[PDB]
Design a protein around this ligand. Sequence first.
Ligand SMILES: Nc1ncnc2c1ncn2[C@@H]1O[C@H](COP(=O)(O)OP(=O)(O)O)[C@@H](O)[C@H]1O
Ligand SMILES: [Mg+2]
Ligand SMILES: [Mg+2]
Lengths: 19, 335
Amino acid sequence: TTYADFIASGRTGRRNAIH
Amino acid sequence: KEFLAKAKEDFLKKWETPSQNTAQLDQFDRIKTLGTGSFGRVMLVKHKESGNHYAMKILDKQKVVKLKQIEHTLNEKRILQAVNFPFLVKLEFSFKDNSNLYMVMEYVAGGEMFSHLRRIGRFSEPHARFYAAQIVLTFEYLHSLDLIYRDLKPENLLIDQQGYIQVTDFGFAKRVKGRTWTLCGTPEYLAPEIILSKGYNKAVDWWALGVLIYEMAAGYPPFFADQPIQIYEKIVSGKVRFPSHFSSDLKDLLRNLLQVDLTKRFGNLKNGVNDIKNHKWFATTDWIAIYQRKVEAPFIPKFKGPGDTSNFDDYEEEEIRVSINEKCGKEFTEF
Ligand SMILES: Nc1ncnc2c1ncn2[C@@H]1O[C@H](COP(=O)(O)OP(=O)(O)O)[C@@H](O)[C@H]1O
Ligand SMILES: [Mg+2]
Ligand SMILES: [Mg+2]
């Protein structure tokens, strides 16, 4: 499922900016 | 129509003559770190003479310079001290010392939207709509002042004691009448025209609202991957898939906010924000009642008293260091 793929991804925590 | 005229006059007065040096560090006791971001640390502090609690953002001048954020940091403070709106955090004091810049805000005790969203999983559509409506009104206000906000995401949205939103983090906000070009923001929330280096305007904020509504209602963003580069490829293709539980009205709104073609994106057409306010997904929204904070919020955070930090994650604490030598004095003269 898309949810399962998100939770297993590396970007479920607080996200920093790019600059 | 008339309210925004009056609002622009108070804003312009403060934009043209900003407040400066309205407190000093030794007026506060530092308690606990509430959050770190890409650039600064925000601590809970207690003001000694009043007993009030505040959130103090601390920026290390040398780090700001190293990350090439001088102008952005001056924008941040100049804009935040000039605005006034129910859903924007209030800046109470600002000052600087040899090493750091300080912005002291009202403390918003309910935590980041981010934490509640990840824990609960997703918000139901009426819950997401309640938050989305507050952002629509906030962007209407900001854009009427020629401001682009440029960093909407749950990490920069706080829930107050009544369950309403407070927008924080003006680090990328900019007053601009034409186009601007800086590559800045958070990958998941970047509009295609930013990635493509085309020049861009206030429409990027309406794209980001589309991303936020999707993430609130789905529990995950519309474009994600392990590496930003792969996120960018998905954004510029513009292909979006919707969860099975999204209402038809929500899908229609999102197709119009997550529109790659600027000339078709809601918020950027002849009717401006009214295309969004008049959309069927908002048909039950009483825009005036939201502005007046007369609607009962769907979620009210728990608080055991002033100074309670239980709605925030714990962070490693670091000492505030102040050099005996002034750093970057001329660069930050106007702060
Ligand atoms: N007024 C506030 N009250 C409570 N917490 C806040 C406040 N402002 C910011 N924070 C917390 O501090 C974090 C970082 O602040 P922010 O201004 O976003 O810094 P950065 O520019 O480094 O991201 C936020 O994500 C939030 O957790
Ligand atoms: Mg932030
Ligand atoms: Mg920031």
